Structure 1
Amino acid sequence: SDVLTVSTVNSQDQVTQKPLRDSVKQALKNYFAQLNGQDVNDLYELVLAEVEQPLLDMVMQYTRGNQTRAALMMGINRGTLRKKLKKYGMN
């Protein structure tokens, strides 16, 4: 079913997959808990930053720096990818 999963362990030392989306939910449940009513302001840019960084890092690494193959693999434009790389200061 799900292609994007992470590894978990239980009290019985069994390793099991769980969708990445469950991780995201958790991170946010924790985030919302920690702040009692303080305002949130740029949650989309925050999450997006947290997720775009390790995605570029991983596909630049898998394509050995090849921006072209990177951009193909991601389904985005070579220019967009240059943009995002610059935005996170990884180039």
Structure 2
Amino acid sequence: SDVLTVSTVNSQDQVTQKPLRDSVKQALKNYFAQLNGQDVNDLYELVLAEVEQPLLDMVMQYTRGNQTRAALMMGINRGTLRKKLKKYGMN
């Protein structure tokens, strides 16, 4: 049912799959703890940068550098994909 997931180990050394979203939650839950109450700023543009980069990396690995195929595979116009690569200096 659930396609984007990550392996997790438990007390009894049983590896078991968990939805990526569950990690994203934890990641923040922690981030908020760290902050006492220091107003947050561009949390979106932060999380994006944190997700886009792994994603771009992987499809530009799975398509072995093929931007034309990479774009197709993600559903975004090639030119957009170029903009993002440029945006993290992945070109």
With the length of structure 2 as denominator, give the TM-score of the two structures: 0.99
**1:30-58: per-residue Cα shift (whole Å, max 9, x none)?**
00010000110000000000000000000
Partner of 2:50: 50
Aligned partner of residue 64 in structure 1, secondary structure? coil
Aligned partner of residue 46 in structure 1, secondary structure? helix
Aligned partner of residue 45 in structure 1, secondary structure? helix
Query: How far apart are the structure 2 equivalents of 1:34 and 1:16?
Result: 28
Residue 77 of structure 1: how far off its partner (Å):
0.5
**1:2-56: per-residue Cα shift (whole Å, max 9, x none)?**
1000000000000000000000000000000100001100000000000000000
Query: How far apart are the structure 1 equivalents of 2:63 and 2:40?
Result: 37
RMSD: 0.3
**1:52-79: per-residue Cα shift (whole Å, max 9, x none)?**
0000000000001000000000000000
Aligned partner of residue 11 in structure 2, secondary structure? coil
Residue 87 of structure 1: how far off its partner (Å):
0.0
With the length of structure 1 as denominator, give the TM-score of the two structures: 0.99
Residue 88 of structure 1: how far off its partner (Å):
0.3
Q: Which residues of structure 2 form unaligned runs of 5+?
A: none
Percent identity over the alignment is 100
Query: How far apart are the structure 1 equivalents of 2:54 and 2:34?
Result: 24
